[PDB]
């Protein structure tokens, strides 16, 4: 019963890592509760597009912090061995 929340800024690097975390644990251990999205806290900025005049412009910007659950139950010795060894994603912060 090990829950793994995977968070990051880039949406893709997460799907890659999260998917790997699952696929690898799909063999040695349980099928995992399956990778999920969860609520993503968004941070947006609204600054002027053009440096002058056109006051009526200032576009919208956003930096999202995506999350994941995965959650792997019924962990076996090899279930963890497949985790500790392989770790690619760098923009992904793991929390087991």
């Amino acid at each position: 019963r090990i829950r793994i929340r995977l968070k990051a800024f880039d949406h893709r690097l997460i799907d890659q890592a999260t998917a790997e975390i699952v696929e690898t644990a799909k063999r040695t251990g349980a099928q995992v509760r399956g990778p999920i999205p969860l609520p993503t806290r968004k941070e947006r900025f609204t600054v002027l597009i053009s440096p002058h005049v056109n006051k009526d412009a200032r576009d919208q910007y956003e930096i999202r912090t995506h999350l994941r659950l995965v959650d792997i139950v019924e962990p076996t010795e090899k279930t963890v061995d497949a985790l500790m060894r392989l770790d690619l994603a760098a923009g992904v912060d793991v929390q087991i």
Partner: protein
């Protein structure tokens, strides 16, 4: 008036980025400035090779750099001598141990970035562009593709008044945000003045 950069307008869709690496609030500036500084030399020292693109990926303290060329032979050098020179001279730019690759381009006629260079090259020399474009457009059209278009501004033929030659074949829907049209732009220094070369290569709808 201008038209939204085809490549930049379709980045969200069929059209990957030149550099793909994880986020970094405080390092984003340095990394980019590095990705731009590495392009600087790869845009010159790799001129005679048909540099189509220069992808960039960055782990912790490393970088791949995959320069796509039409003729990797010139990039590799005699029995692999130039590549050694590059990797080294490039290291001087950024201590970070960088990698390097030389993925060739199958038939440059499909690569816009190259079609532009071939066109400007002839113009830099001195040849009837009307023929250059007519041929260039025919080449990419010959090699296949579903559409193509070339345009050259500046003082064509050394004429006093600036002109803009056209010509195109097939379909080149710039509005259809999906068409996946490979764009290009090649400058051209000349005794009478500068001239821009634009070429569009439409390949597949999806």
């Amino acid at each position: 008036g201008q038209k939204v950069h085809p490549n930049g307008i379709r980045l969200g869709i069929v059209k990957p980025w030149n550099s793909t690496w994880f986020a970094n609030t405080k390092e984003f500036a340095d990394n980019l400035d590095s990705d731009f500084k590495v392009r600087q030399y790869l845009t010159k020292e790799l001129a005679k090779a048909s540099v189509s693109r220069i992808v960039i990926e960055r782990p912790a303290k490393s970088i791949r750099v995959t320069i796509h060329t039409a003729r990797p032979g010139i990039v590799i050098g005699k029995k692999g001598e130039d590549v050694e020179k590059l990797r080294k001279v490039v290291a001087d730019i950024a201590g970070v141990p960088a990698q390097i690759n030389i993925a060739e381009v199958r038939k440059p006629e499909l690569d816009a970035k190259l079609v532009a260079d071939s066109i400007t090259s002839q113009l830099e020399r001195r040849v009837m562009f009307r023929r250059a474009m007519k041929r260039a457009v025919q080449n990419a059209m010959r090699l296949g593709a579903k559409g193509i278009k070339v345009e050259v501004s500046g003082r064509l033929g050394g004429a006093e008044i600036a002109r803009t030659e056209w010509y195109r074949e097939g379909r080149v829907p710039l509005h259809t945000l999906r068409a996946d049209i490979d764009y290009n732009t090649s400058e051209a220094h000349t005794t009478y003045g500068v001239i821009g070369v634009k070429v569009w290569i439409f390949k597949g709808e999806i």
